[PDB]
Amino acid sequence: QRPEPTPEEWDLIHIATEAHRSTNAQGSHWKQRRKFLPDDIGQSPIVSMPDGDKVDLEAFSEFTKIITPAITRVVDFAKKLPMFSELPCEDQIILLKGCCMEIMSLRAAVRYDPESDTLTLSGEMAVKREQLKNGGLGVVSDAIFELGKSLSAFNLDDTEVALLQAVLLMSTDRSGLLCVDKIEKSQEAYLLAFEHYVNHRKHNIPHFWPKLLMKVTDLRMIGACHASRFLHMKVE
Ligand SMILES: N[C@@H](Cc1cc(I)c(Oc2ccc(O)c(I)c2)c(I)c1)C(=O)O
């Protein structure tokens, strides 16, 4: 009834799923290696910042210590998608700076653990809503957790997530792009493959596809609130 990946789109999906899996911290068995950020950390948000806000700085350090590798992995992922590597250097850097939080956020959210109400950062650090609120995301902490809980139910697989990530990456909605039309063709290709792959999985949920497109908007929201700290160093 509802259409299902063409053979060129099965190819796209292999490449994208392998790019995601090869850059997802600790891989598919991440859950068996975790350290819970300890209780005494992230509880006291007392230090002002050059931006005006108060932050439990110890916590902010513990987070800042593991963020660069996480960024690196987003870049590794991007560079493994051929439609992304064909872009000019100038546009690659824009696009990366632009989705890097959208993607790290999604990457944590699908590793939401209802058993302990924690997010899992880079496959190892289990954190509570309040630790990451006080560590420097404000309300953004609350937004990712709501999303975590929301996705438990959708039960996404590494392909769905991979493809979701490519749709985030090839956004045409960024200041400064040269090759806008190429990016939109590629976004459209990924969207259409993704819609098809979702067909191919009979999801025991009504309206799965459109419900899931809505979480794109939530992720672009996250990325818009926490966009400052990405004048990151992209090396192509
Ligand atoms: N867990 C993801 C990676 C990931 C890593 C970290 I550190 C995260 O927290 C942030 C991000 C920006 C900030 O300014 C602060 I303060 C904390 C998140 I949300 C995600 C993965 O699987 O790659």
Compact description:
Helix content is 57%, strand content 5%.
Strand content: 5-15%
Tally the structural domains. 1
The description of the largest β-sheet is:
3 strands, mixed
Order of helices and strands: HEEEHHHEEHHHHH
Please report the total strand number as a whole number: 5
Anisotropy-based shape: globular
| Structural Rg | 18 Å
The secondary structure category is mainly alpha
Distinct small molecules bound, one entry per kind: 3,5,3'triiodothyronine
Characterization of the model:
- Residues 8-214 form the NR LBD domain.
- Belongs to the nuclear hormone receptor family. NR1 subfamily.
- This is Thyroid hormone receptor alpha.
- 3,3',5-triiodo-L-thyronine binds at residues 73, 122.
- It comes from Homo sapiens.
- By secondary structure, this protein is mainly alpha-helical.
- It has one domain (1-236).
- The protein has nine helices and five strands; from the N terminus they run H-E-E-E-H-H-H-E-E-H-H-H-H-H.
- It has helices at residues 7-21, 57-79, 82-85, 89-109, 129-134, 139-152, 158-169, 180-200, 208-225, and strands spanning 35-36, 47-48, 54-55, 119-121, 125-127.
- The strands form two sheets. Strands 1-5-4 form a three-stranded mixed sheet. Strands 2-3 form a two-stranded antiparallel sheet.
- It is globular, with a radius of gyration of 18 Å.
- The relative contact order is 0.17.
- 3,5,3'triiodothyronine binds at residues 25, 60, 63, 66-67, 70, 73, 104-105, 107-108, 121-122, 135-137, 144, 229.
